[PDB]
């Protein structure tokens, strides 16, 4: 039927210290935020699914971006790291399991890692 990009953000691990955490996911300029996970130490089990209806099709070149922040209600969000992927493998195989490290604002690899599944599929389950 009509297709969608579906992103199941599972866990973010090897976090530093203790903080409320929040995730931001973006595709084609449309962003969603996860719920805030309060008082989280080294692993944030977001376990949240995000959906982008796609009117026509997705090209190999398009990018999915994930950003993870330290949240506090009276302060601006503080960026921890970013993950980007091109969607070539997702478009080809319909489903891709991601397990990888985040990148900081100087292109350096940090220990904080991300676990998620990315799908391109019929919205209705088929
Ligand atoms: Mg969910």
């Amino acid at each position: 039927s009509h297709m969608a990009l579906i992103v199941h953000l599972k866990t973010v691990s090897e976090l530093r210290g203790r903080a409320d955490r929040i995730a931001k996911v973006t595709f084609r300029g449309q962003s969603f935020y996860s719920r805030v996970l309060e008082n989280c130490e080294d692993v944030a089990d977001f376990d949240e699914t995000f959906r982008w209806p796609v009117a026509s099709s997705i090209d190999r070149n398009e990018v999915l971006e994930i950003q993870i922040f330290n949240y506090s209600k009276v302060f601006s969000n503080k960026l921890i790291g970013t993950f980007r992927m091109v969607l070539q493998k997702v478009v080809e195989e319909n489903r891709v399991e991601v397990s990888d490290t985040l990148i900081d604002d100087n292109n350096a690899i940090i220990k904080t890692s991300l676990s998620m599944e990315v799908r391109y599929q019929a919205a209705d389950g088929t």
Side-chain angles (χ1 to χ4, degrees), residues 5-20:
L5 188 64
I6 309 295
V7 179
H8 183 188
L9 172 57
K10 297 180 188 164
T11 70
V12 171
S13 57
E14 299 199 60
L15 291 161
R16 299 181 147 271
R18 190 180 197 90
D20 299 350

Side-chain angles (χ1 to χ4, degrees), residues 77-94:
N77 288 347
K78 298 299 188 305
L79 182 65
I80 294 171
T82 306
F83 177 79
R84 283 181 187 170
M85 68 184 284
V86 297
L87 295 165
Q88 157 196 281
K89 269 206 273 103
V90 179
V91 171
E92 287 174 347
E93 298 156 19
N94 313 302

Side-chain angles (χ1 to χ4, degrees), residues 49-101:
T49 296
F50 304 90
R51 307 171 198 78
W52 292 261
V54 288
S56 177
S57 193
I58 299 180
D59 8 278
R60 273 169 147 214
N61 43 105
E62 304 188 66
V63 173
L64 169 62
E65 178 175 291
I66 312 298
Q67 294 193 302
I68 309 294
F69 303 84
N70 282 349
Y71 174 95
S72 203
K73 33 260 82 195
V74 281
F75 298 81
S76 60
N77 288 347
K78 298 299 188 305
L79 182 65
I80 294 171
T82 306
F83 177 79
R84 283 181 187 170
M85 68 184 284
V86 297
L87 295 165
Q88 157 196 281
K89 269 206 273 103
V90 179
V91 171
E92 287 174 347
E93 298 156 19
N94 313 302
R95 163 197 129 75
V96 176
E97 195 70 39
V98 172
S99 189
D100 209 353
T101 40

Side-chain angles (χ1 to χ4, degrees), residues 26 28-29 40 46-47 49 51 53 96 100 111 114 118 121:
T26 303
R28 291 179 172 182
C40 179
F46 288 106
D47 190 13
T49 296
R51 307 171 198 78
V96 176
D100 209 353
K111 280 196 280 301
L114 174 69
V118 187
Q121 59 176 63

Side-chain angles (χ1 to χ4, degrees), residues 35-53:
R35 286 185 284 272
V36 175
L37 289 186
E38 299 182 305
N39 198 31
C40 179
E41 272 188 345
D42 61 305
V43 178
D45 187 1
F46 288 106
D47 190 13
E48 262 187 86
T49 296
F50 304 90
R51 307 171 198 78
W52 292 261

